[PDB]
Write a protein that binds this ligand. Structure first.
Ligand SMILES: [Ca+2]
Ligand SMILES: [Mg+2]
Length: 223
């Protein structure tokens, strides 16, 4: 996350870190047995780490549970990143408490202008590499589809929305992929892609979760 702030330990209780010997993506807990992340974060051998703040220090509120199965969207396209969403089932149900909580799925899509909270352990430099150990947060508004499409001509589908600052300076970055974009108490986006990080006129692009609620509900109830 570039131009963000330190969230504070466990203030984003639904934030998950996907680990395959090291943190490689973020995710969101939707209920005790399931996590949603980005399909491009797919890997075999994932351990889900809940209740984290510093990912290099066991501070006492973590739960490390292995994934029993992963389901990438039936229409995910790795070339355009369209339908960039995946579901991960935990081998054991997590114990929800103050530090580990699930996030609600949206009943409707959010409007441009709505402020959201984006979080993750990704790079914090637009030009450079600095990986933080504690969770960083960023408040950013959803941008109009028109400013999103002018930034990325012929690359935005109805399953994506842009959030950020066209002036640049604040944005999600690598290591933040798969993490949450929460607006008004609902999970509305998933950190998907962008052009560099925090560049001018290059906002981040997010998977638009409101278009996948029936698929999520159906899939988790049948697995
Ligand atoms: Ca830790
Ligand atoms: Mg993240």
């Amino acid at each position: 996350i570039v131009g963000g702030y330190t969230c504070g330990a466990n203030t984003v209780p639904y934030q998950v870190s996907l680990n395959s010997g090291y943190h490689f993506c973020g995710g969101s807990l939707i209920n005790s047995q399931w996590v949603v992340s980005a399909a491009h974060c797919y890997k075999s051998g994932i351990q889900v780490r809940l209740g984290e703040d510093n990912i290099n220090v066991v501070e006492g509120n973590e739960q490390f549970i292995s994934a029993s199965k992963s389901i990438v969207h039936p229409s995910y396209n790795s070339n355009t990143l369209n339908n960039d969403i995946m579901l991960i089932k935990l081998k054991s149900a997590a114990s929800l408490n103050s530090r580990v909580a699930s996030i609600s799925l949206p009943t409707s899509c959010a409007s441009a202008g709505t402020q959201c909270l984006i979080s993750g352990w990704g790079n914090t430099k637009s030009s450079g590499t600095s990986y933080p150990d504690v969770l960083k947060c960023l408040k950013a508004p959803i941008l109009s589809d028109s400013s999103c499409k002018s930034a990325y001509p012929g690359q935005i589908t109805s399953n994506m929305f842009c959030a950020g600052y066209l002036e640049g300076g604040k944005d999600s970055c690598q290591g933040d992929s798969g993490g949450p974009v929460v607006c008004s108490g609902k999970l509305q986006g998933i950190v998907s892609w962008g052009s560099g990080c925090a560049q001018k006129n290059k906002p981040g692009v997010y998977t638009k979760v409101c278009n996948y609620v029936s698929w999520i509900k159906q899939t988790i109830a049948s697995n």
